Amino acid sequence: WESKFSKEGLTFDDVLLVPAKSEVLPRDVDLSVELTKTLKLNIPVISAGMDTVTESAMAIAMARQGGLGIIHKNMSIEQQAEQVDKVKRSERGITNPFFLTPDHQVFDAEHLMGKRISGVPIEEDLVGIITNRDLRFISMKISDVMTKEELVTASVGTTLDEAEKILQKHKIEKLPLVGLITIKDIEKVIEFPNSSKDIHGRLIVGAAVGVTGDTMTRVKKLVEANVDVIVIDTAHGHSQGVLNTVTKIRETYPELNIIAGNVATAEATRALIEAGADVVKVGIGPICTTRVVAGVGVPQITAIYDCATEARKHGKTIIADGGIKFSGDITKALAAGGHAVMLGSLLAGTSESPGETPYKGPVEETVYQLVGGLRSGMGYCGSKDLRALREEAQFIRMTGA
Amino acid sequence: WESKFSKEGLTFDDVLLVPAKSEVLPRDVDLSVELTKTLKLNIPVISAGMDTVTESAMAIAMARQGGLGIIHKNMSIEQQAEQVDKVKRSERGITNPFFLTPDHQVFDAEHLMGKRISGVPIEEDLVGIITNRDLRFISMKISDVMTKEELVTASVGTTLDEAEKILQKHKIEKLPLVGLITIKDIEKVIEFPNSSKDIHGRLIVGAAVGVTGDTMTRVKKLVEANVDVIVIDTAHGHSQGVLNTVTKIRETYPELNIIAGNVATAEATRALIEAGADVVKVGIGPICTTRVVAGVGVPQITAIYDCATEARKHGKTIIADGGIKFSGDITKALAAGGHAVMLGSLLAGTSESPGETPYKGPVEETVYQLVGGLRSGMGYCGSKDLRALREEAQFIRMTGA
Amino acid sequence: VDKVKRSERGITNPFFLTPDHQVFDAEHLMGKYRISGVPIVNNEEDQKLVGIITNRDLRFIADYSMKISDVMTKEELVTASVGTT
Ligand SMILES: Nc1ncnc2c1ncn2[C@@H]1O[C@H](COP(=O)(O)OP(=O)(O)OP(=O)(O)OP(=O)(O)OC[C@H]2O[C@@H](n3cnc4c(N)ncnc43)[C@H](O)[C@@H]2O)[C@@H](O)[C@H]1O
Ligand SMILES: Nc1ncnc2c1ncn2[C@@H]1O[C@H](COP(=O)(O)OP(=O)(O)OP(=O)(O)OP(=O)(O)OC[C@H]2O[C@@H](n3cnc4c(N)ncnc43)[C@H](O)[C@@H]2O)[C@@H](O)[C@H]1O
Ligand SMILES: Nc1ncnc2c1ncn2[C@@H]1O[C@H](COP(=O)(O)OP(=O)(O)OP(=O)(O)OP(=O)(O)OC[C@H]2O[C@@H](n3cnc4c(N)ncnc43)[C@H](O)[C@@H]2O)[C@@H](O)[C@H]1O
Ligand SMILES: [Mg+2]
Ligand SMILES: [Mg+2]
Numbered sequence: 001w002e003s004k005f006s007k008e009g010l011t012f013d014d015v016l017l018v019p020a021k022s023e024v025l026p027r028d029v030d031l032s033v034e035l036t037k038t039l040k041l042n043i044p045v046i047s048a049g050m051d052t053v054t055e056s057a058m059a060i061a062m063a064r065q066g067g068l069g070i071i072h073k074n075m076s077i078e079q080q081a082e083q084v085d086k087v088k089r090s091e092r093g094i095t096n097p098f099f100l101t102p103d104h105q106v107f108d109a110e111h112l113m114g115k116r117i118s119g120v121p122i123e124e125d126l127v128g129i130i131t132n133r134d135l136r137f138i139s140m141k142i143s144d145v146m147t148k149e150e151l152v153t154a155s156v157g158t159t160l161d162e163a164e165k166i167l168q169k170h171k172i173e174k175l176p177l178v179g180l181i182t183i184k185d186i187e188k189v190i191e192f193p194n195s196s197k198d199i200h201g202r203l204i205v206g207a208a209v210g211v212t213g214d215t216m217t218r219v220k221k222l223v224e225a226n227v228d229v230i231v232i233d234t235a236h237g238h239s240q241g242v243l244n245t246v247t248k249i250r251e252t253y254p255e256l257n258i259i260a261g262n263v264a265t266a267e268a269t270r271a272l273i274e275a276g277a278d279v280v281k282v283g284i285g286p287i288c289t290t291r292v293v294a295g296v297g298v299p300q301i302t303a304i305y306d307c308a309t310e311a312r313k314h315g316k317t318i319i320a321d322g323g324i325k326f327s328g329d330i331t332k333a334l335a336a337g338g339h340a341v342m343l344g345s346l347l348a349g350t351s352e353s354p355g356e357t358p359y360k361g362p363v364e365e366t367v368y369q370l371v372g373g374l375r376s377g378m379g380y381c382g383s384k385d386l387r388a389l390r391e392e393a394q395f396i397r398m399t400g401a
Numbered sequence: 402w403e404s405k406f407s408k409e410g411l412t413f414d415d416v417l418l419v420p421a422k423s424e425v426l427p428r429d430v431d432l433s434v435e436l437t438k439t440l441k442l443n444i445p446v447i448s449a450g451m452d453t454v455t456e457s458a459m460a461i462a463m464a465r466q467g468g469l470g471i472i473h474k475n476m477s478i479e480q481q482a483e484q485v486d487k488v489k490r491s492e493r494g495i496t497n498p499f500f501l502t503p504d505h506q507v508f509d510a511e512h513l514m515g516k517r518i519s520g521v522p523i524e525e526d527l528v529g530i531i532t533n534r535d536l537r538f539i540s541m542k543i544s545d546v547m548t549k550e551e552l553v554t555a556s557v558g559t560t561l562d563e564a565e566k567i568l569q570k571h572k573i574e575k576l577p578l579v580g581l582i583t584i585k586d587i588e589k590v591i592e593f594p595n596s597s598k599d600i601h602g603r604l605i606v607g608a609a610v611g612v613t614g615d616t617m618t619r620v621k622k623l624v625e626a627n628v629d630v631i632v633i634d635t636a637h638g639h640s641q642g643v644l645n646t647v648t649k650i651r652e653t654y655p656e657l658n659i660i661a662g663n664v665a666t667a668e669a670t671r672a673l674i675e676a677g678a679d680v681v682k683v684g685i686g687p688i689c690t691t692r693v694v695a696g697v698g699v700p701q702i703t704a705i706y707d708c709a710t711e712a713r714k715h716g717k718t719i720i721a722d723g724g725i726k727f728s729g730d731i732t733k734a735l736a737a738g739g740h741a742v743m744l745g746s747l748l749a750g751t752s753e754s755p756g757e758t759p760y761k762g763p764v765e766e767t768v769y770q771l772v773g774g775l776r777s778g779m780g781y782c783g784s785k786d787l788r789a790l791r792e793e794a795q796f797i798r799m800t801g802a
Numbered sequence: 803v804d805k806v807k808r809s810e811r812g813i814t815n816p817f818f819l820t821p822d823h824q825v826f827d828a829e830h831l832m833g834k835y836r837i838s839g840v841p842i843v844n845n846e847e848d849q850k851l852v853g854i855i856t857n858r859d860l861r862f863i864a865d866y867s868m869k870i871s872d873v874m875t876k877e878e879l880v881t882a883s884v885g886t887t
């Protein structure tokens with residue numbers, strides 16, 4: 001009753017980071033973060049498990065840049081496991097390509113192309129190939145007037161080196177495997193050297209789990225899809241139902257990476273860790289609904305710091321899921337103690353975001369500017385890597401002016 | 402980790418100056434400031450080394466009023482040394498005047514005039530003189546119908562007194578030196594009694610230096626141009642590259658005045674002083690970019706006070722480069738401990754500012770109103786001179802209301 | 803007036819090159835005149851068509867100065883006679 005109003009809380013706009021001596025330039029800063037022994041990122045950015053942010057396209061783009069994507073749970077157990085599998089199997093350089101027959105018309109091909117592939121190999125038991133440049137000399141007509149005689153095909157097992165070469169020789173960008181190896185397929189295997197991967201070189205991916213009756217079956221299929229981390233995502237993780245679900249999943253899958261639902265106090269962070277969570281996601285009402293509707297909330301900087309302080313007593317990790325609005329907030333969120341930040345609204349309108357509906361272009365645009373601001377902030381702070389920003393950077397408290 | 406959020410920070414709008422007993426009127430206040438033993442100002446105002454603020458025109462106007470101009474570095478090493486030399490050679494009362502020949506047309510003269518001179522003496526191996534009033538009785542025609550017979554010329558070495566007299570006798574305002582001595586040239590040698598000058602009576606000037614590969618060559622030519630102070634200007638002076646550049650310049654030119662790049666902590670101020678800087682420029686994110694992009698910043702009043710406290714332990718000087726928006730902020734910035742303020746945005750649109758592009762008129766308009774407010778503030782504080790404002794004026798902390 | 807009278811000249815004088823030149827040479831021509839193709843002749847005198855080089859050909863090469871002869875299209879080279887519609 002007497003300590004009812006003792007606590008104080010700071011948000012992003014209450015603090016600024018203080019410059020310190022710096023021996024490193026913003027570009028030479030290390031942005032890698034080790035969430036668990038088996039979940040390492042090269043940039044500390046995670047796309048949220050929301051149906052407006054992250055499906056397989058976003059998760060692949062996020063992982064390609066060194067981050068992580070969380071497949072949302074607003075889909076059936078079967079679809080979500082397919083989304084996870086689609087990310088894990090990517091960057092292999094195509095066993096199931098799109099196909100047509102000589103009976104179809106070019107109108108079928110163009111629409112299959114528009115829905116962004118540029119080549120369609122030509123029933124149940126290879127005759128040709130039709131591409132975009134073939135469409136320039138055509139007038140939907142019929143697809144049998146395709147590239148039928150001059151067909152360059154490879155064997156199944158042909159190496160990428162045994163390509164980028166057959167292709168350069170025949171000046172062709174597609175190579176069917178009588179499968180498919182393209183030339184974008186070969187070059188995207190080099191364009192992303194910072195790609196976050198598991199120990200077998202596959203792109204990492206995460207999947208969202210709630211606390212319902214079928215989440216044990218959902219986790220089962222996601223684990224069977226080689227998901228790298230399960231995000232038990234709830235509005236209040238300090239509930240007993242979340243704690244029990246965390247423990248039941250830990251005891252069933254002892255080595256599975258687990259991220260647990262939004263909390264904002266050290267006490268809740270300890271409960272989630274003791275239940276078996278590897279990573280604690282932080283953010284309770286970071287004029288959002290929770291504050292207006294329920295009167296509940298914690299200023300995010302205070303939440304990050306209090307939860308980070310508790311989590312690193314146990315050697316565990318914090319994810320800052322909340323009100324990041326500029327690149328400078330990422331620098332504050334991590335310097336306050338967070339190991340990685342989660343984004344949703346910032347990435348919701350990008351090209352790799354779900355649906356076609358505000359358009360924001362490729363998500364690489366946004367992540368580049370956000371990471372660029374982080375690098376600039378770590379330069380001012382002299383932050384060698386992310387632990388130095390976390391453990392040593394100092395803040396200055398500001399009046400609102 | 403525990404002192405991560407301990408520090409507090411004050412900006413201009415958080416404080417007000419408290420009136421004290423006053424024995425001096427605002428007009429009898431001394432505004433002189435001694436930045437170094439060889440860099441003294443009569444007003445504590447410095448125009449910033451920005452390509453939108455300070456070139457030779459601004460530096461001459463600033464020095465004429467008792468201040469200082471910093472030639473920006475967005476030009477070649479040769480141009481910048483020429484800009485410095487153009488300020489150092491001014492107020493001599495013209496060895497290289499504009500010239501034409503009897504073959505040219507009056508259209509050539511008017512355009513040479515418009516680009517603000519009023520007289521053009523009339524090849525490689527004096528025949529006439531053409532002026533603005535001659536143009537009233539002309540119709541671009543040809544320049545040979547000029548003032549050719551009634552030519553009043555003086556010898557090289559004729560004293561100003563040996564003028565203001567030849568001119569008053571022949572009722573003419575131009576006197577060629579078969580060079581040029583005008584009448585504005587003679588009268589501007591008296592109009593500016595507060596002009597800040599070196600020990601040889603030349604207008605002081607400063608030049609901007611970064612930390613690149615050729616800055617040692619840049620400093621070499623600027624020193625060869627008799628620059629009074631070098632401003633090593635960077636976004637983060639607490640970097641090791643800045644410290645090394647400060648030391649290398651100090652060891653090469655031991656008596657050269659050095660102002661060092663933006664810092665906002667006592668620790669950085671000590672580093673810059675120990676590296677060899679004479680004056681430390683203060684201002685890191687004083688909703689600017691640094692705060693939004695990097696999350697870094699220090700409220701300027703706290704920055705000035707902390708850096709001034711450290712600098713005067715070593716007997717050195719602080720320049721307040723930041724968010725001054727009214728004349729009252731100059732009074733706060735100096736009372737917080739700064740020895741002089743740097744301005745950029747306020748002077749960017751003035752007549753003496755670079756280019757023709759918001760127009761703000763002569764820069765003497767702005768500096769007069771800004772200094773007028775400072776004088777008024779020192780009157781309220783009873784500040785005899787600038788040290789009394791710095792060392793004795795008290796502030797009151799205000800809620801935002 | 804002369805510029806309009808000479809607009810539709812029908813190109814009788816085609817801009818060509820030889821296998822001796824480097825691939826840079828070809829990019830120069832394409833980039834200078836907004837042209838997408840250079841026919842390659844055996845010599846400056848006996849202008850005899852040996853090959854043609856184009857941008858889609860340039861795409862298949864990392865920047866290189868290799869002889870255009872190992873780069874150009876020669877095996878399935880398609881021409882037409884003067885006077886074809
Ligand atoms: N069926 C499918 N199933 C699954 N995923 C698929 C897919 N098709 C594409 N994808 C995916 O789509 C991604 C996007 O890459 P692409 O769509 O391949 O994009 P690109 O490499 O830039 O091709 P571009 O658009 O330049 O081709 P163009 O017609 O100009 O130039 C192509 C030229 O190649 C020629 N060509 C192709 N095969 C030929 C052959 N056998 N013989 C002769 N010419 C051939 C054509 O005639 C034409 O001139 C791929 O990475 C892949 O993952
Ligand atoms: N060539 C040059 N090179 C470098 N810097 C230059 C320059 N010319 C000017 N400047 C600079 O420009 C600055 C501006 O000063 P000015 O341009 O001289 O401005 P001012 O003194 O106010 O002259 P005003 O505009 O009133 O002259 P007006 O024609 O009415 O009245 C002038 C009268 O003088 C008479 N006059 C001049 N010389 C005469 C002569 N030899 N014999 C007879 N009449 C003569 C004319 O006929 C006319 O009636 C100078 O301070 C100087 O630094
Ligand atoms: N030397 C010259 N002198 C004067 N004016 C000139 C000129 N060259 C061009 N012009 C003028 O410039 C314009 C010609 O260029 P544009 O007509 O404007 O260009 P485009 O064909 O639209 O280019 P694109 O990029 O699609 O073609 P690609 O590389 O795929 O190229 C076609 C594809 O087919 C292949 N190909 C082309 N010809 C071939 C042939 N004979 N045999 C085999 N393959 C051939 C190529 O390898 C490539 O894959 C016209 O105004 C023309 O009059
Ligand atoms: Mg294409
Ligand atoms: Mg006049």
Ligand SMILES: [Mg+2]
Pocket residue numbers: 133858
């Ligand atoms: Mg083409």
